[PDB]
Amino acid sequence: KQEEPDYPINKFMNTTDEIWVFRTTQENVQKCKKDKNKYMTTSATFFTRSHEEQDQIHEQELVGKFANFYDKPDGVYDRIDITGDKTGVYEEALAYASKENTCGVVGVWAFDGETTVVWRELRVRNRPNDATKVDEMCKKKFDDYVQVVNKSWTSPYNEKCK
């Protein structure tokens, strides 16, 4: 089995397009969850992460310091260590990215008060109104994962999202 390429998360998040959460295994679902990148250096990205509660937008300014997921020296930056999130997310890592980064599968690690909470999201550049144009290879990587961990997923997005 040929080794999959590492998926650079700095290239995935380097866009002015909104990156919407299209699928998630998160239990406490944030409706209309999305990211808007604002600035990026070689060591960190700066982005606005938002979601809606009762149709009202809640925003946070987050910082992600690039790193390699396996802590390999000089490895590909497929991971960000996150500061500024009041929900406790401290790391995300890009498990798959489509060509031109139109879609990505992102694992999330958070800390509540007791232990690390882990889930996974399928993220799409621009509004995923036409699901038939979202890369099926991206969907299948997410499907393969939810089959392995035996979990169901929901979609935080609908047209109503601001």
Residue numbers in the entry: 29, 45 to 59, 59a, 60 to 114, 114a, 115 to 203
Sentences from the paper on this structure:
In this study, we identify a family of complement inhibitors from the hard tick Rhipicephalus pulchellus, hereafter termed CirpA (Complement inhibitor from R. pulchellus of the alternative pathway). Functional and structural characterisation reveals that members of the CirpA family directly bind to properdin, inhibiting its ability to promote complement activation, and leading to potent inhibition of the complement response in a species specific manner. Whilst many molecules act to control inappropriate activation, Properdin is the only known positive regulator of the human complement system. All CirpA structures share a lipocalin fold with a short N-terminal α-helix followed by an eight-stranded beta-barrel and a longer C-terminal α-helix.
Using this strategy, we were able to purify CirpA1, A3, A4, and A5 and determine their structure using X-ray crystallography to a resolution of 2.0, 2.1, 1.8, and 1.9 Å respectively. Overall, the structures appear very similar, with the biggest conformational differences in the tilt angle of the C-terminal helix H2 as well as variations in loops between beta strands 4 and 5 (L4-5) and between strands 7 and 8 (L7-8). We identified three regions with high conformational variability between homologs. All these regions are part of the observed binding interface between CirpA1 and properdin, and hence the conformational differences might render other homologs incompatible with binding human properdin. Another CirpA1 residue undergoing a conformational rearrangement upon properdin binding is Y122 which forms a hydrophobic pocket around properdin P377 together with CirpA1 residues F122, Y131, and F150. This pocket is incomplete in all three CirpA1 homolog structures. However, it is likely that the homologues have evolved to target properdin from other species, especially given the identification of multiple CirpA homologues in a single tick species.
